Amino acid sequence: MTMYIAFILSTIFVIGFVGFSSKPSPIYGGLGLIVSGGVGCGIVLNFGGSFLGLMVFLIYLGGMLVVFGYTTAMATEMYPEVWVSNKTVFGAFVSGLMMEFCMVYYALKEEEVEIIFKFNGLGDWVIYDTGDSGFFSEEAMGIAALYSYGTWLVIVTGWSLLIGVVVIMEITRGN
Amino acid sequence: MNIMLTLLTNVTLASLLVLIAFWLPMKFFLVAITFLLFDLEIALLLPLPWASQTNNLKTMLTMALFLLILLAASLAYEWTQKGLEWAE
Amino acid sequence: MFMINILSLIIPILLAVAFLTLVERKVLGYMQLRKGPNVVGPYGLLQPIADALKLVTKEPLRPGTSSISMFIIAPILGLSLALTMWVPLPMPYPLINMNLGVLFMLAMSSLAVYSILWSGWASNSKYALIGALRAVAQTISYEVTLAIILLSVLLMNGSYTLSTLITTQEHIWMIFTSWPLAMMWFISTLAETNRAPFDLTEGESELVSGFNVEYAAGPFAMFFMAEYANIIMMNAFTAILFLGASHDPHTPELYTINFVLKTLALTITFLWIRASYPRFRYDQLMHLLWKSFLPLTLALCMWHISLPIMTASIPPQS
Amino acid sequence: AGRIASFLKNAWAKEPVLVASFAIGGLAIILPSLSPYTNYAIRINRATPYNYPVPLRDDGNMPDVPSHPQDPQGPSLEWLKNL
Amino acid sequence: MWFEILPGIAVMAACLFIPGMATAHIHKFTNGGKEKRVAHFSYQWNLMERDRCISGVNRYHVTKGLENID
Amino acid sequence: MPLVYMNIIMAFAIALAGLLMYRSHLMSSLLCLEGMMLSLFIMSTLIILNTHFTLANMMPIILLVFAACEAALGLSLLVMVSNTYGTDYVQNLNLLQC
Amino acid sequence: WKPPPWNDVDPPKDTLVSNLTLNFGPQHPAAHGVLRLVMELSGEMV
Amino acid sequence: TYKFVNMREPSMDMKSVTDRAAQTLLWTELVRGLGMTLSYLFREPATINYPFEKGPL
Amino acid sequence: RGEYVVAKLDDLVNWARRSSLWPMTFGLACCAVEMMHMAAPRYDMDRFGVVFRASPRQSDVMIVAGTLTNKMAPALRKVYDQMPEPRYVVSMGSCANGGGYYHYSYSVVRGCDRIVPVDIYVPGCPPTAEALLYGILQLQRKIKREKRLRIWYRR
Ligand SMILES: CCCCCCCCCCCCCCCCCC(=O)OC[C@H](COP(=O)([O-])OCC[N+](C)(C)C)OC(=O)CCCCCCCCCCCCCCCCC
Ligand code: SF4
Known part of the structure; x- marks a missing residue:
């Protein structure tokens, strides 16, 4: 429909995870996460969070995952398994299908799913709050505090990234 | 909605005109990992425009410039210890 | 209503992409002292039609080593990306007024590299695979400077709203304030768009065709048109960024004339720049980027963040 | 001195991009400190009413707060007007 | 000569002209001789619903002024 | 509680099962570990944006910039076992039997 | 289970090079024509 | 008789280094290359209009 | 009428293909240089379709310029099969036509006909650069007199 669009996207998000959790060929597994990464931003986008969502596209989907499949490109064997290949991969995929079907069926009929966390099965929209945000975006004005309140965060995350640059050379140096 | 409609229409147009064209007729790793670390460090200062309008921008000045010198510092250590001069 | 605007945007974009093949062979020739496509069609007005029709009537070859699943998603992933990237362009009043349009344009620009990456894997040839491998690594290396140039430029502009570009750039072109970054930006456009001195893949002899090494007519239409499609826009993005025009609310015609002429002139320089320079060797791309372009861009971002603070010139995001 | 000047000259001879980067980064770190408009930038930054000026319960003894919005009492951004 | 590239250039200007006028004129037609009211922040949004709900015809673009109130 | 969160919560669990179970390739395991922090990112943003916890918007950006540091380390280790063993199959990584 | 190497150095395997010739x-006008070249390289270094 | 070719010496003075540094930063020989092609754009072509025009013999 | 409809479609397809060939250079000898003057502005060929797209996969007509050798025989051939149809080959010069000046030699096959189906023959040693432009033009008119959709209608 359109009311369940976040639910619809969330459903594609779960099945997208089964795509790469089943551990298919690394390129194909990356693609299964690429769509999973794509829809997940839309879930965030529907809740607001434009900037936080946009990063999932930019620095993760077009970022971390680009060099991810890039490594799989020059590595890996000469015979990449096609999604069907090993019967376990398709067995894992159908296995992921039966988990999301049983809960969703249970979610939309009895609405009293208690698996681990007790969760009531209503539409996505019955959780949004109310109120006007004035002239400032809540997400934009929050992470803009990186340089006004994010004092100890910047000092530590910056320092580790510099150590991140030095650790990667030291491991890749080859002594 | 409009955003979804726009992207959906683009996919169909690409799909439609693809179909008519089908039925009618360590160095390599290093450049990847160095980009990955720089790109992640880049995402830190993306919120800079709105952050430039904070009410304590003096502290912003010390720390927004902090990340930028670390960007230089990470490259500087990379450059001096070979690094960007990739294996050849 | 809305849909009629969608075709009114993407369709003229697509038909302009087909024609750009003509000028690529013509204005180069008129500089190369050649004549360019003239015999077919009056003044070569029909050559792109002749070009496009055989590509949609020649035999579409699928090499036995190519995964058909990967062989078909990639050309769609490329062409569609170029078209949906046009939706936040601030043509008087943009079709999509995404307040994060600058990030929106950049985000799917990174999505473009999956088009070449998957095609290089789909083709599955020794020479083809390395050709794409050392092609994607180029594009990703040029996005870090791309983001930094963007970050500095809109810092003086304001928020990331693409419509705000025409407001900040009211009296003076933004290039007069960031000309050291403008050429920094312009060369970066020359590299993501895969054009000489970064033609690399699509180089007629650099990688014979790079992403089109085994990839011939049929599906190849959506893989040699998309690169030319990003050319018109990424120059147009430069036109909005540094060469912004004036927009009268009672007459949006003026800004349409001014912007289109400015972006068309930039594309002429883009076609001018292929016919005047050699091709960078792979090491020279990174040497130019990481060790000269990357440090300079960082320093300019150092300058452009303090300058509004220096002169109390912070821009209003709202 | 002499070697330092020669060091810069040969730095500009073969490595002009980096000396441009270091010079710009070198400046861009120290004018914001001794800038005379930095305080102005802060002043106009707080002088942007994102949040409503919530009224205060009038209990007397406070003359600085205006009784009327147009009243002369209270802060003014006349400085922001000419600059 | 050199101007033989001009008709190749001119047709492009006609093609790129279409998006500029369309998305502007369509805005004028869908807003009633106006432009699409941008909503970059919450205030710009509930302002429209304020205007959309008062119009009675459930359109934000149609505006009722001094002739409406007494 | 909204089903979109349970959709995310299983998304961790199916990602968790894939990371633990292993099939052949460390690339897939590294991929599974990324779905871990991914599903964590949407879950973090979803709660934080819903509750208007303004300062807490810190954590989503901080979360993945450090999760990506795992990729910087995890990807590097793979190529070394790829350089020495050949294929990066987990079965090859058995020298430390004792 | 054989005893671990005393120097803790496990024995190198054979070569794992990808020097494609x-x-x-x-095929390439880049070779100006009939210029069949046979050469091996470390990905880029001949 | 003979003649070298690559025996030009770069001057180390303040003036000479400035032009070289300006050339490196502000690309001028690249622009010189651009000017050469552009001047040729406005140069008339020499394309014989076959079959109506035929080459000399 | 039906025959009119198949005639208009035949003209539309034929006019496109004949006017926008994308030849792939297979020059081996002095026959390559003189065709390579057709690239020179004097006898510009890019005036009508034939352009720099190269990429033997993206090629309609192949121009075999120069002498053909036995060791060149299979590698040239496998190029021809990999060349997608409609594929036509142009025989350049006396050597590629029938061996020419090396007809009685051990390292040359007399003519390209023994290897590929030659659609057009351009005599010369080397043929004058404009004479090939005529050969391309006559090949262009050869495509004009093609009845692919017409012959299908009869079937
Ligand atoms: C108060 C002032 C504050 C600001 C002051 C800033 C400093 C002063 C200004 C410095 C110059 C401007 C910034 C740097 C620009 C050069 C960057 C660089 O790396 O240069 C050297 C680089 C590299 O030169 P190199 O490789 O020979 O040497 C570099 C140094 N070593 C050897 C040590 C690495 O040059 C280039 O990149 C050349 C261009 C490459 C691309 C080819 C196409 C060029 C097209 C030119 C014509 C069209 C221009 C269009 C412009 C945009 C129009 C919209
Ligand atoms: S036909 Fe004449 S010009 Fe052509 S290859 Fe043979 S000898 Fe040379």
Whole structure:
């Protein structure tokens, strides 16, 4: 429909995870996460969070995952398994299908799913709050505090990234 | 909605005109990992425009410039210890 | 209503992409002292039609080593990306007024590299695979400077709203304030768009065709048109960024004339720049980027963040 | 001195991009400190009413707060007007 | 000569002209001789619903002024 | 509680099962570990944006910039076992039997 | 289970090189024509 | 008789280094290359209009 | 009428293909240089379709310029099969036509006909650069007199 669009996207998000959790060929597994990464931003986008969502596209989907499949490109064997290949991969995929079907069926009929966390099965929209945000975006004005309140965060995350640059050379140096 | 409609229409147009064209007729790793670390460090200062309008921008000045010198510092250590001069 | 605007945007974009093949062979020739496509069609007005029709009537070859699943998603992933990237362009009043349009344009620009990456894997040839491998690594290396140039430029502009570009750039072109970054930006456009001195893949002899090494007519239409499609826009993005025009609310015609002429002139320089320079060797791309372009861009971002603070010139995001 | 000047000259001879980067980064770190408009930038930054000026319960003894919005009492951004 | 590239250039200007006028004129037609009211922040949004709900015809673009109130 | 969160919560669990179970390739395991922090990112943003916890918007950006540091380390280790063993199959990584 | 090496150095395996011998020549105008070249390289270094 | 070719010496003075540094930063020989092609754009072509025009023999 | 409809479609397809060939250079000898003057502005060929797209996969007509050798025989051939149809080959010069000046030699096959189906023959040693432009033009008119959709209608 359109009311369940976040639910619809969330459903594609779960099945997208089964795509790469089943551990298919690394390129194909990356693609299964690429769509999973794509829809997940839309879930965030529907809740607001434009900037936080946009990063999932930019620095993760077009970022971390680009060099991810890039490594799989020059590595890996000469015979990449096609999604069907090993019967376990398709067995894992159908296995992921039966988990999301049983809960969703249970979610939309009895609405009293208690698996681990007790969760009531209503539409996505019955959780949004109310109120006007004035002239400032809540997400934009929050992470803009990186340089006004994010004092100890910047000092530590910056320092580790510099150590991140030095650790990667030291491991890749080859002594 | 409009955003979804726009992207959906683009996919169909690409799909439609693809179909008519089908039925009618360590160095390599290093450049990847160095980009990955720089790109992640880049995402830190993306919120800079709105952050430039904070009410304590003096502290912003010390720390927004902090990340930028670390960007230089990470490259500087990379450059001096070979690094960007990739294996050849 | 809305849909009629969608075709009114993407369709003229697509038909302009087909024609750009003509000028690529013509204005180069008129500089190369050649004549360019003239015999077919009056003044070569029909050559792109002749070009496009055989590509949609020649035999579409699928090499036995190519995964058909990967062989078909990639050309769609490329062409569609170029078209949906046009939706936040601030043509008087943009079709999509995404307040994060600058990030929106950049985000799917990174999505473009999956088009070449998957095609290089789909083709599955020794020479083809390395050709794409050392092609994607180029594009990703040029996005870090791309983001930094963007970050500095809109810092003086304001928020990331693409419509705000025409407001900040009211009296003076933004290039007069960031000309050291403008050429920094312009060369970066020359590299993501895969054009000489970064033609690399699509180089007629650099990688014979790079992403089109085994990839011939049929599906190849959506893989040699998309690169030319990003050319018109990424120059147009430069036109909005540094060469912004004036927009009268009672007459949006003026800004349409001014912007289109400015972006068309930039594309002429883009076609001018292929016919005047050699091709960078792979090491020279990174040497130019990481060790000269990357440090300079960082320093300019150092300058452009303090300058509004220096002169109390912070821009209003709202 | 002499070697330092020669060091810069040969730095500009073969490595002009980096000396441009270091010079710009070198400046861009120290004018914001001794800038005379930095305080102005802060002043106009707080002088942007994102949040409503919530009224205060009038209990007397406070003359600085205006009784009327147009009243002369209270802060003014006349400085922001000419600059 | 050199101007033989001009008709190749001119047709492009006609093609790129279409998006500029369309998305502007369509805005004028869908807003009633106006432009699409941008909503970059919450205030710009509930302002429209304020205007959309008062119009009675459930359109934000149609505006009722001094002739409406007494 | 909204089903979109349970959709995310299983998304961790199916990602968790894939990371633990292993099939052949460390690339897939590294991929599974990324779905871990991914599903964590949407879950973090979803709660934080819903509750208007303004300062807490810190954590989503901080979360993945450090999760990506795992990729910087995890990807590097793979190529070394790829350089020495050949294929990066987990079965090859058995020298430390004792 | 054999005892661990005393120097803790496990024995190197054989070569794992990918020095593909590119066949330049009778496909590329880059070779100006009939210029079949046989040469091996470390990905880029001949 | 003979003649070298690559025996030009770069001057180390303040003036000479400035032009070289300006050339490196502000690309001028690249622009010189651009000017050469552009001047040729406005140069008339020499394309014989076959079959109506035929080459000399 | 039906025959009119198949005639208009035949003209539309034929006019496109004949006017926008994308030849792939297979010059081996002095026959390559003189065709390579057709690239020179004097006898510009890019005036009508034939352009720099190269990429033997993206090629309609192949121009075999120069002498053909036995060791060149299979590598040239496998190029021809990989060349997608409609594929036509142009025989350049006396050597590629029938061996020419090396007809009685051990390292040359007399003519390209023994290897590929030659659609057009351009005599010369080397043929004058404009004479090939005529050969391309006559090949262009050869495509004009093609009845692919017409012959299908009869079937
Ligand atoms: C108060 C002032 C504050 C600001 C002051 C800033 C400093 C002063 C200004 C410095 C110059 C401007 C910034 C740097 C620009 C050069 C960057 C660089 O790396 O240069 C050297 C680089 C590299 O030169 P190199 O490789 O020979 O040497 C570099 C140094 N070593 C050897 C040590 C690495 O040059 C280039 O990149 C050349 C261009 C490459 C691309 C080819 C196409 C060029 C097209 C030119 C014509 C069209 C221009 C269009 C412009 C945009 C129009 C919209
Ligand atoms: S036909 Fe004449 S010009 Fe052509 S290859 Fe043979 S000898 Fe040379």
